[PDB]
Structure formats: C-alpha cells, structure tokens
Amino acid sequence: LVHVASVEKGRSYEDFQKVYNAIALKLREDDEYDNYIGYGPVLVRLAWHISGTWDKHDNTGGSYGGTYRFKKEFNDPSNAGLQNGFKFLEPIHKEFPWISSGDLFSLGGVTAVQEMQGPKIPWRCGRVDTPEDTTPDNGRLPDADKDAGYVRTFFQRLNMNDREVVALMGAHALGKTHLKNSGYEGPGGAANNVFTNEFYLNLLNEDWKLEKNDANNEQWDSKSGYMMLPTDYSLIQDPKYLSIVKEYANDQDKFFKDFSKAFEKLLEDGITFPKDAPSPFIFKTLEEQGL
Ligand code: HEM
C-alpha cells in the first residue's frame, strides 16, 4: 500500500494557519466542556486514535485516509467519547471545506498541544480522503488493563521504540478517564489542561494503591485524588521504561523535544511525501500572534 501526500489545490502556509487559528479560537470559546477542562485533551486523543490504527507491515490504517468519518471506525468501542472531538471540529470543516479529513483531525491534535502550552509540533499537509472500504477494522487500538511487555509489543506495530513510547505516554497528564467511555475513572494530576511533564513526576512521587472502580476494573489510585491505568503504572515496573521516566521527570525540555518528534512521527506514519512537497509548517500560537 503506497499513500502519497497531495497538497490541497493551491493551498499554502497561510491557509492552514487560518484553520489553526479557527480551532484555537474555538478552544478558547468552548471552555466549559468536561467540567472546564475544555476540548484540548479529547482533540489530542482523537489525533492519536486516527493514527494509532496504522500497521507497519502492510501500511494499512494510519492518519492518511481520514476513515474515522466512516461508521465502522466511528463506532469502534475503543473510540467511545471521541464523538465530542468530531462534533467540535465539524463547524471548522464547514468553514474550510477544502481541507481533507485526515489533515483536519491531525491538525486539531497539533493545535490543542501548542495552545495548552506544549512544544511546537512540525505538521505536514497532504492527507487525502479514501473510500469507506479502506476503513481499518476494530481492534487495532491498545487495551488499558495490561502490562509493560504488552505496551512494548503493541507499539512495535507502529514502530515506536521505548523512548518514543514513554515520551508519547506523557500526554496522559492531560484530561481524564471517564467511566462511561472506558470503565476507568479519574484524572492523573492537577494540571490536566496545561501540557507539562507531571505524568512522570506523579508516577514517581505519589503513593499508589491498586483499587477496583465502579465498572469493576482495577486501577492505581492515590491519596491526592489521581489515578493511573495498569498500562500507565507499567512504566515504573519495567527497568528500561523506568529509567526514561526518571529522565523526563528530571528534564522538562528533553520531554518536550522528544514528545514533539514522536507525535509528528505518529501523525505521519504511512505517508509518502514527494521531494517537491513543502517543508513542515510550524504554526504560531494565538498568543504569539497577539490574537
Ligand atoms: C497503551 C497506550 C494507551 C492506552 C491503553 C490508552 C488508554 C486510554 C484510556 C482508557 C483513556 C480514557 C478514555 C476515556 O474514558 O475518556 C485514555 C485517555 C487519553 N489518552 Fe490514552 N492511551 C494510550 C496511549 C495514549 C497516547 C500515546 C496518547 C497521546 C499521544 C494518549 C492520549 C490520551 C489523552 C489526551 C486522553 C484524555 C482524553 C480525555 O480527557 O477525554 N493516549 N487513554
């Protein structure tokens, strides 16, 4: 399967910076969502789940085709709760009907991270919508109730290595688990709509307790009111993972730099970019624009 990036006709940096600003302006406006967390965390989760279907072996799945717009992927049990990120973006797609679905879902994730004061993420245009029959089947996204060997093995399919996996998981400092979506409940920290390295700090400094929640699932709970998933706590159980966790709890700039590279790579897996294709765009935030 080859998927070649095709820039939307005649579009350039300024067009996509207009779509960025539209998403970012609505993130500021619709602030009440999920008890004032706002839409940013569900939008970086949506960009991860449309990319996380990729399989390196046959180049199926991935962010290129925008296939989450089809019922099979929209109704995947693993995507429960992401309909709220879709409905947030649907106004903006009506306003810029020329951007492809893959591009709009991935730029929403980029915009949310930078607007929640994360690192800049280089983003590239050119994903092309593909037919309903290209939609990957349910079951390619990871279970939460498993251990470190499962996480390592699952992420080899998206060929991410240990460092990349640990840098990507730092995004679980954002938002929260919702019992009616996943059977898990609670936030992982106090700053859950500002991008920081707090996931790593909480993992190493809190007093975790294995408890059973109302959906009868086990999760790691702390006195402070935070929770960690079994696959999250996995990172301090494995010796290779645990020493990268310590590296990111001791250096927030290295965390930001490595997250930026692994999230771009995540979003680009499966796509062939021609050598005459434009460079990756670095978008300015509303704040850097005085907007
Ligand atoms: C083995 C890996 C992973 C598993 C099992 C997993 C699982 C989960 C689960 C069960 C939730 C709760 C969903 C809900 O109830 O609403 C969640 C939320 C979230 N995850 Fe993951 N995740 C994984 C990796 C990642 C990665 C790599 C990213 C992003 C780079 C990510 C970003 C998020 C975000 C931002 C949320 C919060 C959503 C919200 O607030 O609504 N996840 N994760």
Swiss-Prot record:
Tagged with keyword Iron-sulfur: no
Keyword tags: Heme, Hydrogen peroxide, Iron, Metal-binding, Mitochondrion, Organic radical, Oxidoreductase, Peroxidase, Phosphoprotein, Transit peptide
Record-annotated active site: 49 (proton acceptor), 188 (tryptophan radical intermediate)
Site (Transition state stabilizer): 45
Residues given in the record as heme b binding sites: 172
Assigned GO CC terms: mitochondrial intermembrane space; mitochondrial matrix; mitochondrion
EC number: 1.11.1.5
Function, in words: Destroys radicals which are normally produced within the cells and which are toxic to biological systems.
Descriptive protein name: Cytochrome c peroxidase, mitochondrial
The organism of origin for this protein: Saccharomyces cerevisiae (strain ATCC 204508 / S288c) (Baker's yeast)
